[PDB]
Amino acid sequence: SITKVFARTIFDSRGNPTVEVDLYTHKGLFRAAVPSGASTGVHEALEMRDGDKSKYHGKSVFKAVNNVNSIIAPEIIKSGLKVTQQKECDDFMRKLDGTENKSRLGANAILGVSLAICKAGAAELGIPLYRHIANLANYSDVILPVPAFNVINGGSHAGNKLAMQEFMILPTGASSFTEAMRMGSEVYHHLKAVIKGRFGLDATAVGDEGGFAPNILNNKDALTLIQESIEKAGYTGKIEIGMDVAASEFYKGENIYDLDFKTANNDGSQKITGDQLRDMYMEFCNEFPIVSIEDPFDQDDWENWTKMTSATNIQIVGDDLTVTNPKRIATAVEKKACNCLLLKVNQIGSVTESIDAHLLAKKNGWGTMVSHRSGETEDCFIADLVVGLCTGQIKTGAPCRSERLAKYNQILRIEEELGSNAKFAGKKFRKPC
Amino acid sequence: SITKVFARTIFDSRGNPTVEVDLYTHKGLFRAAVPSGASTGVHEALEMRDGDKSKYHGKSVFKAVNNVNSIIAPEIIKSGLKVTQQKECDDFMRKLDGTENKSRLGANAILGVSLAICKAGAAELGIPLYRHIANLANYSDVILPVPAFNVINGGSHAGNKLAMQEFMILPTGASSFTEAMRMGSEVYHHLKAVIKGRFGLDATAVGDEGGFAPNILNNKDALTLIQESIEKAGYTGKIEIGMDVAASEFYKGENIYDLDFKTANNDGSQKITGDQLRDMYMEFCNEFPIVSIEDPFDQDDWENWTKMTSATNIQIVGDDLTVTNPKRIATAVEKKACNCLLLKVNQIGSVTESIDAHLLAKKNGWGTMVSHRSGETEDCFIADLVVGLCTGQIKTGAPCRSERLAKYNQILRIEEELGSNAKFAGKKFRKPC
Ligand SMILES: [Mg+2]
Ligand SMILES: [Mg+2]
Ligand SMILES: [Mg+2]
Ligand SMILES: [Mg+2]
């Protein structure tokens, strides 16, 4: 089946090199590109960067491309494994690399191949990519996800005083993915106009994910601003709010979080305990239609995770907590630390393992939210991933910048392909299937 | 040949609906999408918008989609024309519309089919799109273009009070399109770092095309900031500057341009004559390595265009002046208004007319710079277009935002496919073929 595997470097949404893989069967070319990654990470699969700080300021991927072309490609072609044997191919590649974190050949070297194998596997069986993924997860039905649009940004990626990283809108009350795109985009455009008159035109420029980082003063104010745009758009009650706090970013240790971590040598006014933080979330959850908070505490502050999950009825999403890693996910389940997995395929490094992490979550009652990375490409694989895995929710950007629209556009195309069989997750985004 | 034509809505990179077309032949599915200008010159072919303020702030394209699905599709299929006859297909749709500006069906309806016909014609002849385009223009050789990256932004869509719209960098000194990419991205990252230290982190947010709009105070400083960045990256002497003034935006009416048009109720200190504008351009070209200025005067202020093209030896690009329109181009040639065409397929509305416009320009000694719109998609047609038309220059964004990288990445893929036959326009970007 596999007659040719070939890697090149392309440029990602942030202007940095990344790996793209072309793979050939008798049915044609199947192409996939790899989003940004870790490279340094205690528990992530490691993306291989060249590190030559005089080429591309250390971000080029010639080594990883070379690992595909001179190691993976001849080995997996010689194996005779077929592109319809996803697990056998993914296992074969992990064994060939032979390290826990895929750091011999690189996770970006393996994932590109695994993703293209998966595209080719579907063509081999004459089915769309999302249907093939569904069969690999043993779903008989698929579902269209609620989109979670990044809109307002804080944390270490903004000059404002906001410690919480990103605020998202979720059209859980749309009747279709089509209405959800309309709802997402009109609110975005209303938010953009508000921002233009309150903060000025330069506040209208966008970050990596296509959202805004105006000079908002506090986290509550971001929620209020989002709430007011939902209302100007006439969708109050059909849009809910998601949050990614990224609390590791301002954890001081000994149960202390600093909401003014971006002010150097500060007075300690905004240093507070974990439970003070938890109370802050519950105030937010009482005033605003918040349905999901990701990384509400530090990646290792289990105690605070378990108490918040126990105290709330909303989605609690592990990202830095779980890093798409079955071992970490198992701990978090054991401790009841959260109730939803953020799924970054390139964090584990293969399709099979990504499906396996989703299934481990689903087996223990968790939701799964499919996620982009900050450095995306025109690749839209995770559009088919979220539909095939029936998770009901994807975070893949503001409705702006085509590395984000490429995904939302591919879901629209899937919605159209499915006709009357096209269920939208809606209010059941947490446990749809 | 044509068995099905179906159009849909997708979202462009600015979060606005636009037209995507699927065309089918016995060779398969061929997909093309239509870009959109954030600001459109007055003589452009009619982009058809629904204009219902309640939906997508009037920007939905349901009528244009229906014009493909319910008029163009049944008619062109009935005609039995083949995707291999570009002109006759294009002529048939133009005649089906009946208007000069494509105002009955929409330029966005006709271009989507035209672009997809073109991709299907290439497949029909077993050749890459760039080769088919090249054949359609009677070119035997193709050339990779110098990329023109919009790094620094002013004008109506920036907040910084710079009147000139785009500042661009051109690695004319690169030895290959790959090195041009390495140079563009390395300069971009250095520029980002320069802006961060001097203007703050938020000044690193990007505009529509991935570039920056810091709070520069005068146009000279923008050019100074770029010079500094080119030196940081260690490429002074290999990188040249281009400019898109977009002068129709600050033209007062009777040979008076206002460089402070973005300051409301200003003093007249910055209002000046076309002749003083041209002198300013000359001082810039004397001090900085500017090789190209686009729309330096108003879209109908013919006399200043002719005076500047006479006085200078640099490239003078028509954009809003020519609107990719052979009739407007013919006027310009007669007045020797400029010496380069900005080619925007959706300004005219068909592949044939677009190719016609380039051929008329080439016949009269002009360059041709293929161009994106500010509202782009994941579509990468124009990457093959610039290669097949041998123009040697393309402006399709900063190396940031995947609606821009998609085009740059497609040229990298073509460069690899061309192999040892791959020629980079380099210093011959104005007249490479
Ligand atoms: Mg996160
Ligand atoms: Mg995000
Ligand atoms: Mg224009
Ligand atoms: Mg222009």
Explain the overall architecture.
The structure is a homodimer of 433-residue chains. Chain A is α/β, with parallel strands linked by helices. Chain A folds into two domains: 4-126, Enolase-like, N-terminal domain (Enolase-like, domain 1); 146-428, Alpha-Beta Barrel (TIM Barrel), CATH 3.20.20.120. The first copy, chain A, has helices at 62-79, 86-97, 107-124, 129-137, 177-199, 219-232, 274-287, 302-311, 326-335, 345-348, 351-363, 381-388, 402-418, and strands at 4-11, 17-25, 28-33, 146-147, 149-153, 166-170, 240-244, 251-253, 256-258, 271-273, 290-294, 315-318, 340-343, 367-371, 393-395. The first copy, chain A, has a nine-stranded mixed β-sheet. Chain A has a three-stranded antiparallel β-sheet with strand order 1-2-3, covered by helices on one side. Chain A has a three-stranded antiparallel β-sheet with strand order 8-9-10. In chain A, strand 14, helix 12 (381-388) and strand 15 (393-395) form a beta-alpha-beta unit. In chain A, helix 1 crosses helix 3 (107-124) and helix 4 (129-137) crosses helix 12 (381-388). The two termini of chain A are 33 Å apart. Chains A and B meet through strand 1, helix 5 and helix 13 of A and strand 1, helix 5 and helix 13 of B. One magnesium ion (MG) binds at residues 244, 246, 294-295, 319 of chain A. The PDB classes it as lyase. Keywords: lyase, Litopenaeus vannamei, metal protein.
